[PDB]
Amino acid sequence: KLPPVYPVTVPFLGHIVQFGKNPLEFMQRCKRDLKSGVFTISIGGQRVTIVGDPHEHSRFFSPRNEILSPREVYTIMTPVFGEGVAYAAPYPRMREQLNFLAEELTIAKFQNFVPAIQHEVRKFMAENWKEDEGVINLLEDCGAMIINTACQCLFGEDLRKRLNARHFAQLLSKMESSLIPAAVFMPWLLRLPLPQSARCREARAELQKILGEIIVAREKEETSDLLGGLLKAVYRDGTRMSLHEVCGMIVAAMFAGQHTSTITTSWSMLHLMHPKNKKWLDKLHKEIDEFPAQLNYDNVMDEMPFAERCVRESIRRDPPLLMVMRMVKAEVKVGSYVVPKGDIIACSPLLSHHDEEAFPNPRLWDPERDEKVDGAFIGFGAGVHKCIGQKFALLQVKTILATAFREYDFQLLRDEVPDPDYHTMVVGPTLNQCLVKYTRKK
């Protein structure tokens, strides 16, 4: 009573070599040659049992933290959010902090956002794309837009004054370097010592100070932004959040967005500018060219169903997070087989989204397709741990698309849509392939 195991050769390594090079081919091979969408592979010592049977998704997603803990797995972030925050925190507290972040992320907050985004994007666009035409690296240029957009939306003029978009980004990288995504199956790796940590901490500590002073002054002035929103939060204890915690929460939110949203906006534009996709590109202007030159919340939330399909397709074909994963607290039946505690269990957006019985012709970016298995899309995952950023993220992205594609016209400098570069922890179009030429529509 246990899933088929894909045989190992270089024993102390296990499957890392193959899995590192191309995760999909490998996990596909695994599935095919084992004749099961549920299978176990090995990273170093660690057993890892994967779920690429969409018919099984619920099994991974639905069970309680009691049965599968996302903590022992994501404690690789702990340098970045700080001790006793998020997965460091105890379950109830972890759960609690997450709600606080969600509530500051619900639609209600959004009404001001749509113009805010448009303002930044245009600002960047006019500021950074000044000719009738020119050459830009889309992914790079996109990313700045994403970081600017979030801040406009989530921080206050006061904060922006003490924390300019560009510099917030650098701060965030610094922590980023502290991470070894390897340890997610190998913690003692977490135990190894890294120089980066120093920079991460400096950066992290430094930030707080900026927060502090901003906070303190605000108190004296006595605001509706995320931070402020976060402060007013209170636990089931009835205790307020600490300035450590408020930093960690901000940071998580900042972290999740920067790459993942930025990547998706890029993937989406790359597809639409592709001549082969021109029909799809046209069926977009059908949707957005009658719009005001000042987009409104409704335009995007309720009046933009096509693009959402695009943005979703992008995320289906090229999920930026290949794996979501848990530790197994107790044996839980999945499919025929049973999984013992001690196993990293893990479900893949990558493997699951390429499932022929669920997404036939999976490398084909067909926006108007739908899953053909129930809950076989998991780009924002599912269950308790379903994304609490998707609405904001999607909103952000749609606004961006409409804005850029209203004024500017783009040509990809390549025969084909760039390949995925799988060598980063968040997976994106290959950086050097993302050179695009724009032409001012005007």
Site residues (CB under 6 A) for ligand TU1? 74, 76-77, 181-182, 184, 192-193, 252, 255-256, 260, 321-325, 387, 425-426
Tell me how far apart the alpha carbons of residues 97 and 246 are, in angstroms, rounded to a whole number: 9
Pick from 276, 307, 280: nearest CA to 291:
307
Q: Is 387 known as a binding-site position?
A: yes
CB 247, CB 207: distance < 8 Å:
yes
CB 39, CB 5: distance < 8 Å:
yes
Tell me how far apart the alpha carbons of residues 392 and 145 are, in angstroms, rounded to a whole number: 15
Which option in a copy of itself, ligand TU1, ligand HEM, none does residue 13 bind, with CB closer than 5 to 8 A by kind?
Answer: a copy of itself
Does 390 help bind a copy of itself (rule: CB under 8 A)? no
Helix (H, G, I), strand (E, B) or coil at 257: helix
Which option in ligand HEM, a copy of itself, ligand TU1, none does residue 208 bind, with CB closer than 5 to 8 A by kind?
Answer: none
CB 179, CB 80: distance < 8 Å:
yes
Tell me how far apart the alpha carbons of residues 261 and 256 are, in angstroms, rounded to a whole number: 8
Tell me how far apart the alpha carbons of residues 173 and 26 are, in angstroms, rounded to a whole number: 30
Does 423 help bind a copy of itself (rule: CB under 8 A)? yes
- Of 349 and 418, CB closest to ligand HEM: 349
Does 324 help bind ligand HEM (rule: CB under 6 A)? yes
- Of 381 and 438, CB closest to ligand HEM: 381
Tell me how far apart the alpha carbons of residues 160 and 152 are, in angstroms, rounded to a whole number: 8
Burial of 328 (0-12, 13-18, 19+ CB in 10 A): buried
Which option in a copy of itself, ligand TU1, ligand HEM, none does residue 149 bind, with CB closer than 5 to 8 A by kind?
Answer: none
**Residues 367-426 contacting ligand HEM, CB under 6 A:** 379-381, 385, 387-389, 392-393
Nearest approach, Cβ of 321 to ligand TU1 (angstroms)?
5
- Of 178 and 264, CB closest to ligand HEM: 264
Altogether, the residues listed in the chain come to a count of 442
Which option in ligand TU1, a copy of itself, ligand HEM, none does residue 393 bind, with CB closer than 5 to 8 A by kind?
Answer: ligand HEM
Does 142 help bind ligand HEM (rule: CB under 6 A)? no
C-alpha 76: how far from chain center:
16
Would you tell me which residues interact with ligand HEM (CB under 6 A)?
A: 70, 98, 101, 105, 253, 256-257, 260-261, 264, 315, 319-321, 324, 379-381, 385, 387-389, 392-393
Annotated binding site for heme: 387
